[model samples]
Target: LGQLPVVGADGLRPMEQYARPWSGARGTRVAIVVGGLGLSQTGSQKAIRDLPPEVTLGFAASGNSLQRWMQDARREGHEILLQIPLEPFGYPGTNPGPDTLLAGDPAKVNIDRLHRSMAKITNYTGVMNYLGGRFLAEQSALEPVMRDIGKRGLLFLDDGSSAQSLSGGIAKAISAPQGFADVLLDGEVTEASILRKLDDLERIARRNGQAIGVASAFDESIAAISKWSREAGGRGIEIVGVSALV
Candidate 1:
């Protein structure tokens, strides 16, 4: 059974018993990339700064309006990565963005779209798969796109929308096997609850060796992650980038 750790809604680990370490890593390391928050037009610059170097922010890579967002995010000292919005679980009917570097048919065209989109954003360390909204589980065509990312030295985040995903598989099959989140603490945007979720994730990471997590920019999620990170770091965990995990 591929039974994963049981995480409580509070975002905390089981108090009485922590799981065994996943590997030699002393503690669990969680990375939170808040999406669409610090878009160029918004206060993405400051928003990025708000997140310490420990947490990597997934900046928006839009086919529309790219310059302001990227330039400011980089100026502010955030570890920059493009937020590549894949076709989301939404499909033929959903209408993913045109030239959206999406995951699906017409791989050649979709990939070119990604490159063109990337051309717009600057200082991007890698890309995070946006909206696991679409299923890329068995799409062989998309693998080359993922592989090309590695060729460019960029990492990929699978968004964990589907367990049967080609994200990790393609990344490995391609070049640089990047990273993906292990859990999402708060689906409702609450701090105490998300912190508890983060703790549970940490415990799991400690037990296994490493863990990755996804979170939105709800005020609580950001604050709790930042606070716990300070404490978690002291205990033994090391927040890292996708490449670092590899």
Candidate 2:
């Protein structure tokens, strides 16, 4: 069988099928997605081994041993997402990686590249952008990609780094299940900073019923998120899989 995800003949979607179950509680909920796994052997291994199962893991499509890592993450009860690189503000100056979906390319060309990335691993509940401030801002470029993701019964999570991202509107127009990060936990890449961001996320969740946070799989991020998540339950906050919020 091919590794590419497909909708089941009976209309079952992969997003629902692969989602990690959570208690349907009516409390403040937060979802943290630690991305960039499979990029470094030790980093990926450490994140998977240390992060709580409630923290969703995202595997970079361009990273190594993704299939193996996906299996490990799923076995650990962590909901996983495929991270596809997309064109950033600067083209080659700040490249995302090989086969990055570009903004000005033909729709077919970009979709083909998307497929290449999607085929890297399977059993993911959804896909999120690794970088793509430029590509995500262009509605024409992102619509086709979103359409494909929705058609395959997957969610698209906007990392919320791009101020001009039209993902929310586009996803709504197409009826695609979508999520947007309310906080970025590793912009400063320190335990203190990450913890502060986590606090911010909790505040947002308290106000909005739920909030999502995104972070890289750096050691500092893993440490802070794990430490914070371990005690979140006592604080009346439920740390859940990203799929739970989406």
Candidate 3:
């Protein structure tokens, strides 16, 4: 029921039907994505209501009540990204939870796992790695999936969580529509800390004309972002949907 409708096997072809409209604001644009939604019911609900609608929401495939949560996020003017678990260094111990895409696994097996994860939800504009340092480092393992993702008319977002990740290059090689997070919004998970990161994101946006930040759906970070985004434009930065950056 959640299959990607625009199917293909090669090239970039993102579906216009799934992407949210850009803000078209004439200012420094910043796209913030909060991942790990649907894992904590309270956190997810708080994030949906507290954070500005411009922030992209990424839901874990392994989380509860995903479809309904995604629908709620979309209805509130947010774009969605599916969080595909990927193998990290020391994986199995530093596990990525269920349905993880392991670099060492056969391509067919991994792709089947990917499809199964995709089928667990709907209406996502793209996919992002969840703790995928090792898996993303291997182009041999990542390329085929990137190709498949591009052909399916969905974009990919490199979470910027791994310095070793080759996702940016792979996306470029496969011509996948893609974007990368410039900062992790709640790496420290404190209100003051998140606000500082927001300032840093704004500075980057001003310098590059755009910046993206990834965060978790924690109450502290959500509250911080909600407060910060309200005054984002006043400080000469524009909060935009993730698709705007893509």
Model 1 over residues 129-188: C-alpha lDDT tens digits? 766545456566557767666655456677676777777666665556467677877776
- Among these predictions, the greatest lDDT belongs to 2
Note each model's CA RMSD in angstroms: 11.3, 1.0, 2.3
Location of the lowest summed lDDT over 10 successive residues in candidate 3: 5-14
- How displaced is residue 122 in candidate 3, in Å? 1.5
The model with the greatest TM-score is 2
Q: What lDDT is obtained when candidate 3 is compared to the true structure?
A: 0.83
lDDT-superior candidate, 1 or 2? 2
For each candidate, what is the lDDT? 0.60, 0.91, 0.83
Q: Which window of ten consecutive residues has the lowest lDDT sum in model 1?
A: 13-22
Q: Residue 203: error of model 1 in Å? A: 0.9
**TM-score between model 1 and native:** 0.76
Clashes of each: 24, 0, 0
Q: Which stretches of candidate 2 lie over 4 Å from their true place?
A: none
Q: Which tens-of-lDDT digit does each residue in 1-246 have in candidate 3?
A: 476535545543444556678656687888888889989998888988888787888898889888778878888988888899999988788976768999988999899989988888777778888888899889889998888888788888898888888988988777888888998889897888898898889889899999999998888988888888888878777777777788
TM-score of each: 0.76, 0.98, 0.94
- Score residue 190 of candidate 2 by CA lDDT: 78
- Order by TM-score, highest first: 2, 3, 1
